[PDB]
Every structure is written in C-alpha cells, then in structure tokens.
Symmetry: D2
Subunit: 351 residues, 4 copies
C-alpha cells in the first residue's frame, strides 16, 4: 500500500509499505477523512521525539473498519468509526495506576505517528479494536468528527487538568485549534472570565465563539502585565498553556494567583528546558501547581466526547477552515500546518 511518511528527521514523502495485518484483537481501518497536526511538524522538522525512518504520519482520522481479529466482538467490517489519537495498551501497570496515556512507557499510549505508522496510508492498524474505537454517528460530518480524535480531547483535557471551579477566571495562551478547544472546555467546566491570547483574526473570532470574554495580543506588551492590568493586579485563577514557546511557562506563573493551577497541553518540541521564575512562584511555596499531560484516548473517551458533540455541547465545525477531497492532498494539507497561513485553523482531507 501507499502512505505519506517521514523519510527521516527533516524529510518526508510518499512511500510503499506492506499492508498491516490485524492481530487477534486488532482491526485494520482505511481512512475516510484525516487531518494534519502541528505535532507532526515538531516530530519531523524538529525531531522532538527522536529520529525515525519511513514512519507513516498522521494520527487524526475517522474511517471504515476493513478487517478485525478473531477476538474482536464489538466492531466488524463496514463499521464507520472515530479513532482517538491515543490508543493505549489497556493491559498495562500504568493503566492500573490511572494513566492510560503512558501505558508501557512515557507517552506510549499515543502510538500513531509517535512510533507507529500513522493514518496517512490507504490502511492503518488499530490495537485492541473493542477498547480503542468508537462508532461514528451516521449524521455526523466527517470533518467535524475528525476534530474529536485529537483537538477536542486535548483541549478539554487542558480544562480538566486545570481543575476549574464555577466562576474561575481563566487565561488560555494560544488560540490555535488546541487552544480553542481549551477555551471551549474551560467554559464547559464553569469558567467565568476567559482570556484568550492570540492574533490570527480567524482564531480570534473562533475564540469568542467558543467562550472567550477577552482577547489579548502578544504584541502589545508582556502578556503577564496585560493580564494583571485587566484583573486589577489580582491575576487569574487558572492558565492553560496551548501554544507558544517555552517562555509561556514563566508568563503563566506570573499571571496566575497563588494557589492557582497551570495546565500545559502544548507539545514543547524544542529547547533544553522550561524556566519557572523563582520570585513569582513564591520561591516554590506559592501553591502554584504546574500540570502537563498527553490527551486521553480509548473507546470510553471517544464515545463520551462524541456524545457531547451529538448533544451540541460544542460545535466543532468552527475548527475546520480547509477541506480537501482526494488522498493526494495530504501532502499539501500537512505543509499548511508548517507554513500556517492566516485563514487556517485545521484542514481535513476527505478521501
């Protein structure tokens, strides 16, 4: 089969690969719709996850089941399914410890395009079908459903890790697709004021659409200062880091209140470390908690998020600015996440 893979760090292209075979508990799926992620640009042109060779990219897709193992009971050929980007090995001590995202290793719950051939191929492999797939509702637009697989689960996890309280004030740094879902998630956790930080006009409008009450541009003065001004020097209760460089950690620390929580869902693919300003972190005694985690995956998570969409808790259509028809457009679509044009949030390639 054919697949669009990374031909080593800093290089990519279409390659020929043997079609994967399903294990007793797995399923082979052919994509019906896929989307490129900024994370795949970190992995390729930054090698933030180490080197790789001939690894088919992509981890955001909805498709049709073509083959299932002899032990698969809840899925069969013909089923259209939503595939979370995180497909953990449920039989691991990490799962028993409460962290499905790290089953058998740090980040190992996320396989597709991490270390396992991705969804940008005529067919792809899903480990443990019954535990990692969810049925795609018949009336659900493909482009919308693809947003559940990574953007929605990641942005919401940002809101979940933030442990938001009814009326909490929240700052979401970065209003790209992940940041927009962080805003939506924060609103769906009861947040009062929500301050989104970004400049790309299209993202600014979506930010407000999802719940932002204030929008700040990281080019009108240090974001910390702006936030303090807006909050009368009181700061905010929570900060979700969803975009920008590692310096955003310091900014988050300076703008969050003592006792607050900073939740990172931004995949930092460059630099040796992230700095915590000593003074503003109360010399390590300000109870300014810092969290950061990979998005949850698996069937339960996908079914729960899917159902929220079906119940109109969030409108994912606003995330998709670019829709293409035809496998060949995957190359160009991915390159958009690298060049990032002004009118782009997320792109979906419908096969």
């Amino acid at each position: 089969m054919k697949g669009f893979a990374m031909l080593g760090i800093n290089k990519l292209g279409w390659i020929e690969k043997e079609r994967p075979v399903a294990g007793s508990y797995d399923a082979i799926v052919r994509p019906l719709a896929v989307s490129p992620c900024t994370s795949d640009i970190h992995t390729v042109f930054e090698g933030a996850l180490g080197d790789r060779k001939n690894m088919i990219l992509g981890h955001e897709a909805v498709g049709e089941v073509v083959e299932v193992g002899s032990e698969v009971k809840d899925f069969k050929p013909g089923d259209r399914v939503i595939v979370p980007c995180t497909t953990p090995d449920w039989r691991s001590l990490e799962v028993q410890a409460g962290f499905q995202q790290h089953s058998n290793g740090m980040l190992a719950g996320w396989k597709f395009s991490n270390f396992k051939d991705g969804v940008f191929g005529e067919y792809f492999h899903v480990n443990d079908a019954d535990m990692n797939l969810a049925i795609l509702p018949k009336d659900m637009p493909l482009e919308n459903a693809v947003m559940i697989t990574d953007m929605m689960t990641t942005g919401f996890h940002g809101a979940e890790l933030a442990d938001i309280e009814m009326g909490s004030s929240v700052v979401v740094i970065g209003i790209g697709a992940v940041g927009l879902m962080g805003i939506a998630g924060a609103k769906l956790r009861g947040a009062g004021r929500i301050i989104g930080v970004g400049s790309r006009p299209i993202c600014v409008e979506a930010a407000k659409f999802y719940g932002a009450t204030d929008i700040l541009n990281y080019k009108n003065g240090h974001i910390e200062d702006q936030v303090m001004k807006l909050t009368n020097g009181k700061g905010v209760d929570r900060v979700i880091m969803a975009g920008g460089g590692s310096e955003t950690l310091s900014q988050a620390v300076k703008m969050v209140k003592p006792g607050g929580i900073i939740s990172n869902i931004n995949y930092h693919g460059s630099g040796d470390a992230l700095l915590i300003p000593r003074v503003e972190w109360g010399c390590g005694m300000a109870h300014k908690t810092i969290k950061g985690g990979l998005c949850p995956g698996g069937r339960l998570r996908a079914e729960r998020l899917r159902d929220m969409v079906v119940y109109n808790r969030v409108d994912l259509s606003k995330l998709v600015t670019h829709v293409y028809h035809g496998f060949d457009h995957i190359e160009e679509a991915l390159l958009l996440m690298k060049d990032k044009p002004k009118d782009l949030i997320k792109a979906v390639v419908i096969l």
Copy 2:
C-alpha cells in the same frame, strides 16, 4: 420594624421586631427584591428544623446597605448588594477544615430563615459584611440577581458535588428552580446526556432550555426502570437529587452505575430516615457514592456566580415566572410556593 414571620408551626403572619443593629463587622440591609423558597415551607408547615417562634422568614434577596459596622472596609451605605443565602462565620474551625456551610455547627452557615431573622423584613442583618456580600452590577435585573442567592448556588453545588466528567450521563431528579440550576450546572461541568425528571409544563421547557436532552415523567412507570431502558440497561454516571420525597434516594441508587455518584441538594423535610436499597447498592460495595450538601455562600461564591451571569454563562431570567411589586405581596408569593400552580417556577417581590 415589621417582618413576615413564622408565628410557630403552621402559622404565618406579619409581626413587629426590633430593628437589628450591626456589630463592628456587620451590615444592616434593606431588601430591594426577595423571593420565597420551598424551604420556608418545609420549616413552617412541617417543622423540618425544629420548633421556632416569631422568626422572620426568607433568605433570598438583593438589597441596599443602610448601615455598616466601624470595621467594615469594602461596603458602605448606598451599596446595592447580592446577599448569598449562606453567610458563614469565617472565623471557625469548620472553615479551617474546608466546610464554610457548617461554620460553628451543622448547617450553621445558613442563618436566614434557619435560626436567624430572615430577609422578609424592612431590614435584615448580615454578619461580616466584607466576607459575605457582593456588589450588584448596575445593569443586572433585580429579579435575575435574586436567583443567584440560592437557586443558582444550590443547583450548581449539586453539579459540583456530582464530580461530573466530560461526557458523563446525568439524571436530575426534580425540575423545580433548584433542579433547573442543577441541569444548567451539569451542562456547565461537561455533561453529555442530561435526563430531567418532571412533568410540570413550564418546568419541562425550562429544563430543555437549560440543557436537558431527555425528559421523563413518573406517571409513565418507575423512573429507575425508564432510565434503565433509555440507557439500554447500563444506567447513568451521575444522579442529582433536586426534589421529591425521600424515596428518590432509592430511585437514584437503582439507576446509577457502580462507581457512580449521587448528589443530593434536596432539603428533606420529613420522615425518620432516607432509605438505601441494599441489593442495588451492591450491599455497600458498589462504589455508589452518596453526597448531600448545603449550598456554598459568602462573598467569593456570590462574586464568582455573579460574574458567570454577567458573562452570560447561564440565563437566570427563565426561573422567574411571577413578579410582584410591593412588600405586602410577600405573603401571597410565599403561599404560591405552597400551592405550586403549574405555571410557577420562582416568584420575586420587588419592593
């Protein structure tokens, strides 16, 4: 001064009481708008809190500060304020333990109409003005603001105690004002499916408006059985008990999943005890957690909820079905909470 008080069990009427005086940290406030509560009914016509004599009723009001103690720094005469029904004594070991609602005693955080003269008087006393009051926004309708003091904080507390997860399935038993805010709060905590239980026409519509995806009526078969069918034998993740008799606990236990949480915010006014069905509670080993708590109060809570209304996170106007002008209407309004006409949800008396 005059006030509408409980002349004793089953007796209501206007009486004279000395005008309250503020201590160093207190404030004397005159009501601008008030609302009667079903709780006032449990206390009077059922002595749910024990015998009382000439206690002014009511605990839901927005008003104007007339006098403040010498140590009050953040409030002054003339200030328009939102008064949370729960006004805790912040200097207590219970607060130090994390439960403001029980400062100096079980339910002692709630004073108005519990054991302290209520807001149905020409003037009422608010302990610790700086810690228990919030400014009423200049553009906020008085009837809407009154809904923050009890209905919103209570219903939302139901959702908070329910520890809702993104996409959780939730059943709210009872769709009166409190149940409606429970539905709104559940959606604002990320709930997917929300099943409201009620039949009153106006309440049914408000419930769907606040987030209910399904509506069930008792007069159509045992509620627990109906829910089991709807969830195809699986049950729901969470249950918020907002209204009805004590037998609703058994209903909640039967419809909730193992590991689920039952959140009670219903003020049970009669009966010796509440029953838990042994079998369905997994003989006490099914991790079906049961919570039950008094709504939070105090300045922080009121300001956070106030701000949620300002940022249109919830529309409180749908709760007020009846509006009266004139202090004297308090009697008629309070009686409606007793009669419960099918077109009533909440009534507000604007002085």
Copy 3:
C-alpha cells in the same frame, strides 16, 4: 481434582471436578496456603450469593503457578505468587472509567467463589496472569502473605475511601480482621485518634497494636453516644464501617462531623435496606459523604501492598491466630469461621 465446595445451602464437602484449563492469557495455580473468609460462611450458611451448585469456595490464597497460556509473558510454572482476591478483566469500559472492581458488572472483579470456582481446590484458575498476579517474596511467611489477598487490601481500601487527613479522628466500627486492617490503614494515612469498636479480647488487643487509641464496647451503650462522650460532643472526622449490622450506618452518620466521610467495607447481607437518619444527616445537606466499595485487586495493588509488608509498614502476623498444616484442615478451618471462637481472628491452612 478435589476441592471443598458448597454442595448447597447449609451443605459443605469435598467434591470431584475437572481441572480448569488455562486460556491464552491465564494461569493455573495450586495453593500453598489459603484462608477461610467470613464471606465464605455467609455465601453458604446465609445464601448471601443465592444458590450455587457445587461451587468450590475460598478466595484468599498464595501459591505456585503450574501452567500458563501461550500469551502469558511475566509468569511461568514454578513461580510463587500472591493472588489478590479481586482479579478483574482489565479490558472493559468500567476499567477505562476508573473502577476495576466492577469490570463487566457490579462487583464482577471479584470472581473466586462468586461465579468462578474458588481457591479451596488442588488447582484454581487465574484470569489474565500478567495483570492479576504478583510474585511472592522468597522469605515472606506464607500466613502473612495470605492476609494481603483480602484483609489488607480491603481494610486499607476503607482507609483510602475515607480520604483521611493528617491528624483526623477516625472511628472503625468492627475490629475483626478487616476492621483491624482498617485501623492499620487509617494510622498509615496519618490519623490521630483512632477509636476501635468491638468486644472480643483478642481483637481489642490487636486493635491497640495496629493503632487504636480508644476502644468502645458496642454492647455497653449506643456507640454514637459513647463517641460523643469521648469527643466532648464534637464527633469524629471519619468513620470506617467494617462490621456489625446495617444500623451501623445510622450510628456512623450520628457520630461523624458535618463535612465528614463514612467509608463502608462491610458486606451487608440482611434486610431490604440501610437507613440514613434524616436529622443527623442534616436533612441531606450536612456534607456527610457515604462511600462503600469492594477492595481493589490486580497485580499493581498486590505488588504495592506486598512491598509495604516487605518494608515493614505493617505487621500482618497479628491477624493469624490459627495455623494448620495440612490440605484437609480446610473444612475444619471454614467451620472454625462459623462457630467463631473468642480466640480467633484469621485461620491459615498451609497445605
């Protein structure tokens, strides 16, 4: 293969059954040491598990693996293992939802002598060996190791569910083996005062050994009243229900502080329900949380507790008062759990 089973109601006796075969991920184990449980006595002499046709009893044992399925990778014949009484199916949505104990059904994580032959047989079946077994340390006395499989995990789970704080006052109702581990677990969560409730001398001394600072005899006065006397009418922070009748719930609600937590680890098998005293439960608004759950099982749980024993965090030898050397002494021991002498806590048969 022979094994002491429940012939029928009030009927016990050895029987002949075919040796269970292992599935690809299972392991067959032969007992090295086992222990009768109060739950064994109730399933038979009380039909607390309906009617079972020739079901081999027992669910507390440590042993030697004799066979493993083709897909088992961490265990092999000859391995000595600790077998947690709860061996759930790790591939289920309940597990993805955070409740291993109820995987594929309420209390379904508990299989041995529930709907699967128990450990009182020459050989027994363990589902998913890699996820549900833990190696038995070389120099760990067998009697102590068996106490891990249920007494330790259950008692400690009572302390875990109680969400004990440093210096918290705790009451453990019932000082049988489970209550003793509840006492030890509470001390291991930092409890200050620990009040044990029971009457048998052997248990009273053991309770003090594990951490009890006060002892109350339930036969000499209403327990809630005695607790109020010990606490100057203030009540306690937490209550762990580990014994006695279901009225113990009412007693627990009456002695616990508002905002407190009641943790049930006792199997309630009589009557149609448990009662919550309305008044003392603050009419359902006292924030007196009620929890109850089957002990966690699985490999991680077993290795973690095992290591606590290895690092001498708890001395389990005090739980074993009767040690038999012989495979046939199983019937004697089980009946020894029925007639329950005053000098018995737990009996261990080292075959």
Copy 4:
C-alpha cells in the same frame, strides 16, 4: 522590650521596640521555648524576601498567653500554647478560595519573620488567638512541642501535597529537619520504599528512624542516576523537594515516573529560576505534576498535629540535637543554622 531582629539585610542585633499590644481578637504571648530556622538565615544573609527594616526574627515558639483582647473566648492569660509559624487572616478571599497560607497575599498567611515581628523577643503578637493558637499539653516536652510549629507541619505538608498512595515509592531530597519530617510524613501516608538523599551522619540515622528504606549521598553522583539504578530504571512514584538548590527540580523530574508528582517544600531563596528538563518532562505531556507550597498554620492544623504527637504517631525528640537555656542564647542558636555543624539538626532555646 528587647529581642533579636533583622536590622536590615545581612545585619543582625537586638533592638528596642514597644511591647506589642493585643487587639480585640489578639493575644500577647511570652515565649517558653523557641527555635531558629534556616529560613531566617535566607531572608537575612540572602534577602530572599526583599529588604526589611528592624524585624524581630523567629517563628518557631511555644509560650504562655499573658494578654488577650476583649473578644478572645478560648484562650486566657496563663494558658500555655503551641504557636503555628503560619497564622493566617481567616477573613480573606484567599481563605474562601481554600488557601489560608496566602490570605491577603502570596505567603502572607506566614507572618512571623516574614513581614511581622517574630518570636525572638520578650513578647510577641499573635493575630486572632482563637483561630491561630492551640493548647500545649502539660506533659509534652517544650523542645518537642516547638518542632510542631514549623518542622512537622512543613514536612507533613510536603507528604500531603505529594498525594501519596498506599505502597508508593518515594524519594525525599534533603534530610535536614524538614526533610526528616517529609520522610515521617510520607510513611504516615502509606509509602512503601522511601529513599532519603543526604550525607550528614546524624541526619542519616534520623532518616532511617523516621522510615527511610534507602539512603543516597548526592555527592556520589547525579541522584537521578542513582535513583534509576536502585529502581532498575523504573523511577519512583513521588518526590519531595526538601533540600538542595533549584537544580533539584530537574533531578526530580528525571527520577519520577510519568503520572507522578513532585512536591516542593524547599524555600528557594537564590537564583533567577528553576529549570524543568524538556525531554524528561515528556515535552510537557508526561503528567509529571509539580507542586510547591508554604506550610499550613492555624489552630486546627496545630491541634491535629499536636494530637498526632500525643498519640505517638511521630517522635519529634529526634529533631532536637541542641538545647540551650537562656533568652540570651537565641543569637548564638540562629548562628548554628548559618554555619551548621555536622552534628546538628535543630536547636531549642528554653527560656
């Protein structure tokens, strides 16, 4: 009155100030025994707090109440009390928010020798006596009681923040008094393996006494590498930062498992910032939570820890290696926390 104070940054000496006067809710206390803390050495010869003008030092004391305001109800002249180093303003929004330690400002809950005159004076002021004092048991040794005020509450808070689970593996970096309490606290939260890092012989022996199962000398090599060796490359579940410089944060991240928690109670008064290693922090998605907070204070905390000592949950006598007798020794004592000989842990000057 006299006393030892911080006559500016880097300059010490006894100054003459007007004996403090108690307000309506305050109390004046005469020290019976006090102890110097490394924390003051910082504020002084490091200016980690900024600049201070004539601030009496010391915040670890047990004393006699000699004067109370007209509103104090639970304490009176003659009472012997335990004074927590942290004495919050319970009437603040931060308290309403759940953070007593930062009432009215970051770290503002901590007054003595922060911005308020300390206890190294003939008499000191205690804000809100009823809310911030605890009775000293008559049998409890003075030197032991002093250890409660800061060392115990801080070390235990380190264990609390770490959210330790039964059987968790824990590493405590630094074994000075605070770290020793962190070890004792970790053990009292159910920890299995506890690895202590330090070299002072007296501290190492105290580490083992309080629960340490392994001891590591950071001078031997990168502690993260030593820890990985000890745990066969698996890392540990939790880390408590109680000593060393800001680089210990990186070491903590490198030795803790994904999903683990890092708890800082170490007061970092030097350097621009602490670094988080990008790769080992899973690029910010490894769920390696980082917390850090000032110790809790107030009456409830003091009474709970006091009771733990009374019930022998922890033996504080091991922390006191130096005992003097004379208010004039205070000066000498504090100097020990500066040079710090290898046979000293904490010093107590009895008056």
